[PDB]
Write a protein that binds this DNA or RNA. Structure first.
Ligand SMILES: Nc1ccn([C@H]2CC[C@@H](COP(=O)(O)OP(=O)(O)OP(=O)(O)O)O2)c(=O)n1
Ligand SMILES: [Ca+2]
Ligand SMILES: [Ca+2]
Length: 343
DNA sequence: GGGGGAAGGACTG
DNA sequence: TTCAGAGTCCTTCCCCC
């Protein structure tokens, strides 16, 4: 069983350059604006030409312009990218029936019984990595191994515009050299904890006791990690499925007064139902972002589907349920639906 | 007595 | 006065056929 991981080199900012040729040869920064502060918002992405100086996705636009002020800041357009991605996913779909799309710029391929060895697999990464670069003019990084996790790591190492292959003899090697947070699934927090205790490489975990690991990161986190070092990871490539389609916005405000939030919720509660397709959610939650970070949420599950209007109503009771439980103003407010109806 | 629901946190990425 | 913008899965926890 050998996997083929695909990762769009560096998506957004890249597509933005593909459409506007007068961009390349410059540090581009695709980000999200809110309409406030003046330059309020965060960074969604940036080309490698812009990363060099630190402008990494997720930071305040005000900071970005603190390091790379001359760079090229372009507004985010999830609509434009969505379509591109939607196209690339379809190609890969012809190379292997068993496909699994993770995010908007990722996809796992299973070639187990359509490839003889890592030799003709690396040749396939190319045959693919190319059909892509010129049919959509998008560069991508490919990863290959015996499973999804290692396949995804080989792609991390080889980026950008590359491809790598983590063979078995190499795997055992990585399980020793591969370290800290460079592990898919383990976030900064879990890392700033493990490190403090000496655990650096994915192996250091084996010199512990499953329980002493659980008491600090969790049974899932641990079991997962120990499943890697032990080298017995399973997880197959199955078709993905939308579980929770939601939408959130941002108030130029920072309010607490219902009619100073109702229009907002209503707004989001509109866009979400457009993505719901022909789905019927039995569950709905109102996510609310405050000011001093920390998000708050209140939701409810129904024994039947939901109609837009049905949503509007509960939205309020769920919002009041929030306010009366916190003494801080709100900045962004949103809603998320789930538990769609089966077959 | 494993599961459904609700609020929180983290990693997505 | 007024910072940093979609979806999944793990968890602490209370509760019931
Ligand atoms: N805080 C973040 C981080 C990433 N993304 C977006 C960036 C596009 C998509 C995938 O991100 P990555 O793959 O991590 O980066 P990339 O630039 O898309 O590509 P690469 O992984 O090769 O750097 O998710 C985002 O919306 N918010
Ligand atoms: Ca990518
Ligand atoms: Ca990615």
């Amino acid at each position: 069983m050998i996997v083929l991981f695909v990762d769009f080199d560096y998506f957004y900012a890249q597509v933005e350059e593909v459409l506007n040729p007068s961009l390349k040869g410059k540090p581009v920064v695709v980000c999200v604006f809110s309409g406030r502060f003046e330059d309020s918002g965060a960074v969604a992405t940036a080309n490698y030409e812009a990363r060099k100086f630190g402008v990494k996705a997720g930071i305040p636009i005000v900071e970005a312009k603190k390091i790379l002020p001359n760079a090229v800041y372009l507004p985010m357009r999830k609509e434009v990218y969505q379509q591109v991605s939607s196209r690339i996913m379809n190609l890969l779909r012809e190379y292997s029936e068993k496909i699994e799309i993770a995010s908007i710029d990722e996809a796992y391929l299973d070639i187990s019984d359509k490839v003889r060895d890592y030799r003709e697999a690396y040749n396939l990464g190319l045959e693919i990595k190319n059909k892509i670069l010129e049919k959509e003019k998008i560069t991508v990084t490919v990863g290959i191994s015996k499973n999804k996790v290692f396949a995804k790591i080989a792609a991390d190492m080889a980026k950008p515009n590359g491809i790598k292959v983590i063979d078995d003899e190499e795997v055992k090697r990585l399980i020793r050299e591969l370290d800290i947070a460079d592990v898919p699934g383990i976030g900064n927090i879990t890392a700033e904890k493990l490190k403090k205790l000496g655990i650096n490489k994915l192996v250091d975990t084996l010199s512990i006791e499953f329980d002493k690991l659980k008491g600090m990161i969790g049974e899932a986190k641990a079991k997962y990690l120990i499943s890697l070092a032990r080298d017995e990871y399973n997880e197959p490539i199955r078709t993905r499925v939308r579980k929770s389609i939601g939408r959130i916005v941002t108030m130029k405000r920072n309010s607490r007064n219902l009619e100073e939030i109702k229009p907002y919720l209503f707004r989001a509660i509109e866009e979400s139902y457009y993505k719901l397709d022909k789905r019927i959610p039995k569950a709905i939650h109102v996510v609310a972002v405050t000011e001093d970070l920390d998000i708050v949420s209140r939701g409810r599950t129904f024994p039947h589907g939901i109609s837009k209007e049905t949503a509007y109503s509960e939205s309020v009771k769920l919002l009041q349920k929030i306010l009366e439980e916190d003494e801080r103003k709100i900045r962004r407010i949103g809603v998320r639906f789930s538990k769609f109806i089966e077959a």
